[PDB]
Amino acid sequence: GPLGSSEDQTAALMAHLFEMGFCDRQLNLRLLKKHNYNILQVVTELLQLNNN
Known part of the structure; x- marks a missing residue:
């Protein structure tokens, strides 16, 4: 198996949320x-x- 995942991955997922307008x-x-x-x-x- 691999040694370790790519921390950069998370950085990309965060952009997915910011695209909505959360900013958290x-x-x-x-x-x-x-x-x-x-x-x-x-x-x-x-x-x-x-949702509220």
């Missing part, structure tokens, strides 16, 4: 680890959570 590097960080590097679930979370 802190949330995307706590969310990623929550979904285990799952931008899909991360973005969906910030959206629903901020």
Whole structure:
């Protein structure tokens, strides 16, 4: 197996959220680890959570 993943990857996922208009590097960080590097679930979370 590989030695280690690419940290740059996360940097790309963050841009996916910022494209929506969240602007919360802190949330995307706590969310990623929550979904285990799952931008899909991360973005969906910030959206629903901020549905109000």
